[PDB]
Amino acid sequence: DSELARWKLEQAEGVYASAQREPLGAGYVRGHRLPEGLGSERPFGVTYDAR
Amino acid sequence: REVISIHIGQAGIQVGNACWELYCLEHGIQPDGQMPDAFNTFFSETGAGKHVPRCIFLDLEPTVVDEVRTGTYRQLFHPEQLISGKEDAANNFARGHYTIGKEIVDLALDRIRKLADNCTGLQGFLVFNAVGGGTGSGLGSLLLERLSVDYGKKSKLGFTVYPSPQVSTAVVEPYNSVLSTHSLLEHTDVAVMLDNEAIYDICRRSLDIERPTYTNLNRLIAQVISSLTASLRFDGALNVDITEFQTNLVPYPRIHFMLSSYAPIISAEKAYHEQLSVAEITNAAFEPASMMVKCDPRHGKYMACCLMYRGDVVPKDVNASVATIKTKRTIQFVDWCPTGFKCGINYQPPTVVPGGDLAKVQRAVCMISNSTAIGEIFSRLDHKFDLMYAKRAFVHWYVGEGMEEGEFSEAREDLAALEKDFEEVGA
Amino acid sequence: REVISIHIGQAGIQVGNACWELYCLEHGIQPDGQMPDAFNTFFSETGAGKHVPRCIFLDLEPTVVDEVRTGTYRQLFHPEQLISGKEDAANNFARGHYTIGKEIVDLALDRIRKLADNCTGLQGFLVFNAVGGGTGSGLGSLLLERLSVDYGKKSKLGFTVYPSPQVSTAVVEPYNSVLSTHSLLEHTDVAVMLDNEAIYDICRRSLDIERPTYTNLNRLIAQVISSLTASLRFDGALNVDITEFQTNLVPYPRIHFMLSSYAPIISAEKAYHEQLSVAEITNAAFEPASMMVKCDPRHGKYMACCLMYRGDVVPKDVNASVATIKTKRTIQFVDWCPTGFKCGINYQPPTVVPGGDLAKVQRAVCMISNSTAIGEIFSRLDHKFDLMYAKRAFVHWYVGEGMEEGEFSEAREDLAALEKDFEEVGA
Amino acid sequence: DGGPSYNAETCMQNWAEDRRDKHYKSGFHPKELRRSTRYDSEYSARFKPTSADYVGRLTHTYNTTSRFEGLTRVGTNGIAAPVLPKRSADTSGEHVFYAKDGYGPTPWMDHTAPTARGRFWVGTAPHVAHDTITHSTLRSEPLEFQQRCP
Amino acid sequence: MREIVHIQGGQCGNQIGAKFWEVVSDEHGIDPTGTYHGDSDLQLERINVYFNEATGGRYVPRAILMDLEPGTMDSVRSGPYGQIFRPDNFVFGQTGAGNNWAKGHYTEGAELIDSVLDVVRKEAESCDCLQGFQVCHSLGGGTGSGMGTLLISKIREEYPDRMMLTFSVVPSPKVSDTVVEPYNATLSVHQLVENADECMVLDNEALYDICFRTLKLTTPTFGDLNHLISAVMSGITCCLRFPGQLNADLRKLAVNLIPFPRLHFFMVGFTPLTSRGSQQYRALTVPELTQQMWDAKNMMCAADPRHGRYLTASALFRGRMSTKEVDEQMLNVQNKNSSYFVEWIPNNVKSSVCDIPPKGLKMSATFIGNSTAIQEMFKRVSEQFTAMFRRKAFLHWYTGEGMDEMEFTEAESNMNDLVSEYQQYQ
Amino acid sequence: MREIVHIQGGQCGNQIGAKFWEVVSDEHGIDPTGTYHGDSDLQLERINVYFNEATGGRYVPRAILMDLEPGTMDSVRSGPYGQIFRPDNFVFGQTGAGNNWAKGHYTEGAELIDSVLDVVRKEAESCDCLQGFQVCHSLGGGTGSGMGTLLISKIREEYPDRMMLTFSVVPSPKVSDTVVEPYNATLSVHQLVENADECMVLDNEALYDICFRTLKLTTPTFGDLNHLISAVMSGITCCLRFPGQLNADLRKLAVNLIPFPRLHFFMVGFTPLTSRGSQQYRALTVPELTQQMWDAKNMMCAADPRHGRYLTASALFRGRMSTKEVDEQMLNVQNKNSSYFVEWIPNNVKSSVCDIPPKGLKMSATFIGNSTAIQEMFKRVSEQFTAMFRRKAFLHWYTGEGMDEMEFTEAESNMNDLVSEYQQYQ
Ligand SMILES: Nc1nc2c(ncn2[C@@H]2O[C@H](COP(=O)(O)OP(=O)(O)OP(=O)(O)O)[C@@H](O)[C@H]2O)c(=O)[nH]1
Ligand SMILES: Nc1nc2c(ncn2[C@@H]2O[C@H](COP(=O)(O)OP(=O)(O)OP(=O)(O)O)[C@@H](O)[C@H]2O)c(=O)[nH]1
Ligand SMILES: Nc1nc2c(ncn2[C@@H]2O[C@H](COP(=O)(O)OP(=O)(O)O)[C@@H](O)[C@H]2O)c(=O)[nH]1
Ligand SMILES: Nc1nc2c(ncn2[C@@H]2O[C@H](COP(=O)(O)OP(=O)(O)O)[C@@H](O)[C@H]2O)c(=O)[nH]1
Ligand SMILES: [Mg+2]
């Protein structure tokens, strides 16, 4: 019962495969590199202006 | 154009509690309640620069309610509007409809009255409840009854959460469901079913979140509700208000049960790869792999479908895709409705919640349809109701509370009458 | 040619507070008294470079008076032109007519005596008062009495504020209005009624100011007064002086009561919107949506009319418009007066006040007419006066102040005589 | 009835109107600024203030005033003792004229925007104190309450 | 200019007066030291109504404090805003009456009231044009009721032309402190109906459930009640103190609300009164203030007004508003629940507006209703009074001091006929 | 001299009207502020047909908006040439019909139409000599069709001697928005066949085809389709606003196109329409206009004219053209495809020439053909109507408001008899 030990346990067992494939809320990450703009500034998908 | 939203039960107030986080994010309101016209359908400006929602969370157990009262949105909700009883109905329809409702519904309704009097151009009501529980089922039905005798003419959108066929967390929910429908028939104008297993399979398949808690479910349900009211909140190229579903989706005064669907439910990595266009999300909104109710529409025939489009959508290609759908022969319509569709287009794209798993996409589709698979669902609940009732199991709690066998038999034959109505209509 | 104006009561001097703002703005007089011959009928040119008005404000409570003394117009008004008693009359005709009048009225008249001495070509007096109160009613009537004793033959234009039928602020205003009318009959040479419900409906309907205060009322009433003294002030194609209302609109010595009207009451946006022409404003000056007194001339018969025109008005189209009015039959005249109109034209257009709600108009119409719907007014007021008098309510205030039952009885039967009068003349 | 009452820390017996009072201090930091595992309600863990800038405003106000406003009243256990009224005339706090101080970040003052200074559908603090209607109209400023609303 | 002289009687009157001078001093922006610290010059022009200049902007009130026990004098000069009361205004007996009307009216009055008449005269002729007197006292007590009633009598015999407003708290059977509360209440009421011009009937029962239901307070100490009553008194007198769109002094209110000389017992209410939590959410519109004014649960008396008819009513509004919305609101409330008003009087609602909101609020209102539901309150007192007299109980504490039985029988008669005439107009 | 007032209903009508007033304004050279900025004199001389000078050359359109939702009003006020409108003619309800013909014709119309009649009255007697009325609406929606057609009936009962042009969008099965399109279109057609003088039927299907093939645009937003219909409406009312060598007024076109009082549904087309890539490769001659004009893919209805015959036809030419070239082109077209024209009427084409082209173009033309192929549209709607009505789908939201079954049976009767008489005259 301490933040530190509680965090070190997860830092240790992050090497597990299930620990990376079942992040309780996050979901599987795949570790893919994105082109720095599609996450926040630009939205995904093809874009043709309507307005 | 203003609409108020009431939340009954432990499930309903957790859902709308995800909804209001989404609404404040869509309108740029930080949770303390001040801005740094479009909002006026939900938040009424009052006090000092405060946009306080047109909503009442009401429930009997104070655990989740005061949880809200201490949470991040302490300053948002008007304190009086969160009604909280002292003790639960405890998954007992009779207890929530006769014992405890008799003290709570009058306070709830005469709050509702002064909210409607602050309101000016009230469109309608929309309720949030799960019919499996005790409070959301019992006093929810009692609340809808007294609201119908109060206004009657005003449209009431009921977003209910039905119990899944195999995945289930209670034992008496067949009793609660049957008794809840018996009033949901003749009080709600438009009732949308959303069970939990369908959302579970969606979160597993598309969103590839494999240990989904209730928030992920509530998060994307809030996305659906926000999507079908964005026409009221924001100006679109082709807008439809809350009165349209009343006319265009309910061919008969007792057939009002609507499957929901949403697309694209897509994560960040699956977005960078799929090309998001209109024709394929229109396709994606139609397979049972992306419906919010675990049912098989291939065994049923559609009555009328409605398609909300949000974001960057032009009317050309939506008309094209709908043409392709009507020319496909895998899915089929009834012989009554050659014009089996109703489209809608809005300009503002769906927003992202930080911490949520949905990426920012240019466009989205919310399908709300009407079919006969719902008639299959009610028979499914009817069978498992009859099995438990054959042995008179669990009945003594209702009888001990004050109910009897008359309404059990008559609610049973009421669902049998609904079944015969669906089988008569489908032909 | 000069005219001095007196303001009595709490209403009188607030109307003057807006009226004299209009005069300063129309003649380009700075609020500190000096310009950066047409003004000579209102502002005497003292010394060198200073104009100081021919007016008296008076009241018994010093609050609103020294509010004037400390407002924007400190240097403009003579220090002693504004008269102020020590303690209020407090909604009591007897108190305002017998106790406090006996010491304020003598200082008032030996003050206007030297105002008239500085004046040379006096037209007459025009008064501003309300009858619902005590100060306006009591010593307003007491002053009018001693005015009629001193000069008499000089005209007395009376713009009085009667109590509205439904909208009311006081309780004893029927008693005070009756007792004031009993002297307003044989003292004022001609009187213009001003209710408040009529003007509230005007600002609500035409100007669309949803929540109006008194200052909007005072502002457009000042616009009316300016529109009927514009003839003395400025040169027009056909100017009519103050002695014309005496002659052209009073057919009998005890029928002098006139409904007033004004057009166009239009905000800043509907101005660019509408093509202002003389035909439609001469039409709009007749429907009761534009009358300053809440009554319906449909039920009555006109006796005489008078029409002031300001701005770009040629006699051609005003003649054509009144021709269309005489040939219409929705409104009707008495048969014992065929030529029921008087015209009057002045060249200068009505000016606007910064922050005001009226727009710069090319031409405007001020209609003042006589009818028998005023006979309907007095009956409707007399009915509710008898209601209170049957039970002798509130009487002990007046009797303890010095009066008795006789004045109540005689004012009651006088209004009865005026009733018989109006019904006899109207048929 | 007059029976004994639980403390304001316990969520019962009109706790809400009390927690939301101006002279009430809690021995622990508010949930929005908490940070760890161990006693996170499910709702609280998933629902956090989305905007870091909003968190910044929140923390500035909380730290400058409410974090160390009072500490003597805090007991050994961390549960603040209720102020005990002494003298017949002693008043706990202002209840009637609640908006004694206007226009600021904290909840007890109004949160009004600088453009919507005084309007009809919105106001809880005096726009201007000691300004007469007739004064203002003579100065020709338009009456603030008459401005329209959608 | 127009002068109000304030008089406080007994323990209740002294503490209530203390909070009264706290609110008025705040509204004129004067510090508890006695020096002006405001900004707008709207305030300085009307402090002569309530204060007098001493030396270098030092303004001291025109108040007379009256009692028999030094406990109240220390409670006056200990609490805040105690440094401003003139030491000569503390006329002060020494024995203490303690719930005995005969002590309040014959023994202690006989040597205390001559000295209060000295200071009241000195403070009355020190100003020029009196508006009248304003007295706050109690009826269940002895030194308040007896001394106050005897002074009200004496000053009405000297100055018959000035106004007289009295804030009197009456006893109620649910919150009932003393035992001889009916013996004192009846004799005070018997005197007030002839000598007091108009009365504002208060009580503690109405004040307690207001602080429970509306303000939702937990420990409503006496300070909060005195603060409520203080708010009412300030709302009454706002018109003499500040300019407005329609000013209405006290005599203006008396003639609009008193149709018959004996028919002058009002019930009072104040708005707004919001929960501590709700405050921020509540908005401030004239309909929102009206729905709280005409609510029965916002009266400061123990009289459900819907048990009788309203005869007349008055509303005093403060703040920059629109008169049309004000008037049409009074018209709507007069036409919807039309049966609750008398028939032979149309337009029963007097209104007034001032343009100065109270410090800390944007827009306030004060209600003064002359209803006929007051008779049921006096009946609930007279029925108890006629209980004890039947057994001549506690009478010796009265007959042994000068009073006879005929005073009590006269009290029954006057109480019975005034409730008779109120029932007559019902 | 001859006057045309404009009435817009529903969302589709309002946005079409907005683009239409943009087109007319730019043709007459007035900016959105309402001031004149053109160059030639031929512009001002006929603007009294559409405008009223307000004050100092500020022209406002003679138009009346009409709807039930503020959303459309926000859109028309926000766009360019939105401030030019008439703030009093924004006669506008607040509840909302919601695609319910009974709600547009029985409940909301019952209290909103008296107001729009007042407005359209004031606008009619404002002018000297009316020519006709011009209504833009659709036949699918509720607040456009129902209220619009009730306005049509009330107007025809008031002014029976004036013309009436109605631009109506009909529903197509492939582009079908709502579900009660047959229930609205059938009832509206039933009203128009008796009340309206002639109707220019439109549909989004043919417009999408036109912007696909000929225009070759990428994304045809609603602004583009409305721009097309606006160019058509400018073309039909050009002969009044501009001099020509052979003028054709509105009634003149009516009498030449309507041989029988119930045969008044017109398919309309506009020329030229060419992609900006292929604009350089084409010439602008009379035969080049004609070959595009009589092209079946250039009609603005989903009705193949080669599936039927033309009863009559008309072509309005604009620009400095040769009259001899025009009639010989019409003669050759009539002689070549002699089977597509009716037998018992010679000279089946009326022609007119105006001397003013649209801005930016050299020469233009507008085609209004009264062909019998419109029965295919009515048959296609009627079969959907029968299919739904046989088993009473969606009938209670109409029945529960006041409508009976007899109205639906009558509507089927009238549609069936008009399609049979089209079949008769074919
Ligand atoms: N979608 C969704 N459903 C929920 C959630 N929480 C509870 N439910 C559903 O609610 C149903 C039972 O009712 P509850 O909401 O838990 O409780 P209740 O309706 O208030 O009835 P009581 O327990 O007697 O108070 C279960 O079948 C759950 O599926 C949630 O967070 N999201
Ligand atoms: N239209 C309008 N009416 C006013 C104005 N001021 C006062 N009144 C009216 O005057 C009537 C009563 O008289 P008051 O002006 O209030 O007071 P008074 O006539 O001086 O009598 P006292 O109060 O005794 O001084 C009320 O009904 C008000 O409506 C004003 O500025 N404009
Ligand atoms: N509202 C209020 N009531 C009070 C206060 N002080 C005393 N009382 C009431 O006064 C009543 C008795 O009056 P009392 O003090 O005996 O009067 P006195 O002895 O003549 O001065 C009791 O019922 C108390 O409730 C106070 O500060 N506020
Ligand atoms: N050309 C065009 N058609 C439109 C537009 N908006 C809607 N429509 C068509 O109008 C039909 C329905 O009309 P609707 O707007 O519902 O009428 P209303 O609801 O009564 O106002 C649909 O078939 C749409 O295709 C538009 O901007 N332009
Ligand atoms: Mg529950």
Ligand SMILES: [Mg+2]
């Ligand atoms: Mg006055």
